[PDB]
Design a protein around this ligand. Structure first.
Ligand SMILES: [Mn+2]
Length: 297
């Protein structure tokens, strides 16, 4: 049975010892887990999906007004079919790249740090901007709470992450649209935690040994472990190998990752061994992976 964890105690409810234990079991046995009781408003989620379908149904020429080339070093905007390079060929996939909304007078923008700056939003869906940023705020708060549960599940103090790597976290948010195939015909996330919202007719899969379906479950987010959490636990919490295998699907992966300048180190007690070998900051690490998916910029 797939692990579905009620995380209400980490959100708005009285404490329950079993929550941290269940998170630990899920990371050790499965590498991923569903969460319920996350506190993210369902109407906000429904409005994010509705405004997303509205955007992807626009004409291509309108969608390309917020194409990623206009996002600059901030790494934001729209990509059409073929716009992402995965498995060595342009992907039959379109989507949207978002990150923290930073004003131009923010020090990171004034320093010209890659992956920092403003998001792009379409003139044609005027209420999309507010919905997206409210969702990112809700998910950023959920991320911090889930890292506490992850800390507890390792026998650590609950604020272990907040005090070292995630006080000022790297938050990345994408909206992916998979059209039905034109004809009839594996990876790991790089940060700490992926919090994924799936649509109902979603088709996601995760490894085990065996590829298993991680079907959509109402009221849940699917969470999995990233390369940096793998590194920090010396491989105890294994970064989750997954893939998307039909018709028209939307998905909304949210990534809760370390500070851009954080050097995530293995716990001394688990440091017995990319990933475990990598010298540099999370920003260095993230930047290398971004250079491969978009050779443009
Ligand atoms: Mn992924």
């Amino acid at each position: 049975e797939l692990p579905v964890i009620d995380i209400s105690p980490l959100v708005d409810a009285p404490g329950r010892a079993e929550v941290a234990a269940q998170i630990g079991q899920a990371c050790r046995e499965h590498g991923f887990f569903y969460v319920t009781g996350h506190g993210v408003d369902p109407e906000l989620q429904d409005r994010l999906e509705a405004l997303s379908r509205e955007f992807f149904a626009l004409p291509e020429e309108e969608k390309m007004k917020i194409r990623m080339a206009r996002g600059g070093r901030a790494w934001r905007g729209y990509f059409p079919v073929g716009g992402e390079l995965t498995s060595g060929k342009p992907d039959w996939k379109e989507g949207l790249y978002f990150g923290t909304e930073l004003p131009p007078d923010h020090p990171r923008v004034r320093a010209g740090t890659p992956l920092h700056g403003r998001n792009l939003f379409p003139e044609e869906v005027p209420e999309f901007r507010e919905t997206v940023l409210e969702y990112m705020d809700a998910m950023t708060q959920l991320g911090h709470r889930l890292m506490r549960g992850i800390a507890l599940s390792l026998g650590l103090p609950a604020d272990y992450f907040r005090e070292r790597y995630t006080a000022d976290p790297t938050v990345l948010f994408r909206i992916f649209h998979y059209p039905p195939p034109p004809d009839a015909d594996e990876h790991t996330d790089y940060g700490l935690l992926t919090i994924l919202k799936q649509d109902d007719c979603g088709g996601l899969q995760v490894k085990s040994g065996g590829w298993i379906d991680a079907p959509p479950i109402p009221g849940t987010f699917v969470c999995n472990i990233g390369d940096m959490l793998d590194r920090m636990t010396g491989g105890l919490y294994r970064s989750t190998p997954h893939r998307v295998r039909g018709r028209d699907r939307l998905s909304f992966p949210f990534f809760f990752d370390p500070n851009f300048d954080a050097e995530v180190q293995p716990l001394p007690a688990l440091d017995r061994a990319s990933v475990h070998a990598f010298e540099g900051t999370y920003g260095d690490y993230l930047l290398s992976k971004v250079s491969k998916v978009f050779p443009e910029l």
